[PDB]
Design a binder for this molecule. Structure first.
Ligand SMILES: Cc1cc2nc3c(=O)[nH]c(=O)nc-3n(C[C@H](O)[C@H](O)[C@H](O)COP(=O)(O)O)c2cc1C
Ligand SMILES: [Cl-]
Ligand SMILES: [Cl-]
Ligand SMILES: [Cl-]
Lengths: 55, 145
């Protein structure tokens, strides 16, 4: 099962990020959907995009 | 609660697919859709929505959906689908492209309104009206979240 709990957890956490627009959020979920083994890397990189777009 | 993304906690049946991925697979599936179809998120993410179909599903109707998808337009149909345990239900379905600012399609939203029967006449027009409005609201909401 590619979409184990860890993948699902990371996925939920990407969507919680406050500074991403809807496209950016959708893109990371989509990449995660396509390449589940990169979930942790995706969350970490999403956080960097978040931190780089302050309000 | 469960592990749904915040978008997937909106209280309507829908899924969202990415046509940029091979075979246009589900990337979001609402908790309500999961309750309806009896599938868990784990077992349908990354999969084409066609798993909902079965023996009695009218293949011409399904073709109507695929035609719409290929042309990146909306469509509304009534088709028979199946739960995980194989229980029949009528699905008043609406598809609509999710576009960005410049009007380019980015994703597809699909909304299901489940029923024990094929709705006709006034009850079907009322049905069509409603799920179109729901699909519009879901689109609008996703862009806020
Ligand atoms: C966003 C979206 C939602 C869909 N929802 C359903 C559905 O609820 N029930 C169904 O039978 N097909 C649904 N489909 C249709 C299948 O995914 C597929 O488009 C259809 O079976 C035509 O493809 P095929 O001829 O290769 O099987 C949906 C498609 C998309 C893009
Ligand atoms: Cl959430
Ligand atoms: Cl909830
Ligand atoms: Cl498809």
């Amino acid at each position: 099962n590619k979409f184990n709990k860890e993948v699902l957890v990371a996925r939920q956490e990407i969507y919680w990020l406050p500074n991403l627009n809807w496209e950016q959020k959708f893109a990371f979920i989509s990449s995660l959907t396509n390449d589940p083994s990169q979930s942790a890397n995706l969350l970490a990189e999403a956080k960097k995009l978040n931190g780089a777009q302050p309000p | 609660g469960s592990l749904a993304t915040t978008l997937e906690r909106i209280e309507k049946n829908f899924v969202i697919t990415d046509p940029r991925l091979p075979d246009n697979p589900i990337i979001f599936a609402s908790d309500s859709f999961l309750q309806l179809t009896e599938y868990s998120r784990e077992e349908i993410l990354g999969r084409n929505a066609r798993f909902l179909q079965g023996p009695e599903t009218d293949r011409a109707t399904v073709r109507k959906i695929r035609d719409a998808i290929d042309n990146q337009t909306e469509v509304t149909v009534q088709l028979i689908n199946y739960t995980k345990s194989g229980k029949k239900f009528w699905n008043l379905f609406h598809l609509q492209p999710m576009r960005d600012q410049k009007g380019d399609v980015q994703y597809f939203i699909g909304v299901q309104l489940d029923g024990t029967e094929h709705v006709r006449d006034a009850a079907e027009r009322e049905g069509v009206m409603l799920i179109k409005k729901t699909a519009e609201n879901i689109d609008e909401a996703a862009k806020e979240l």
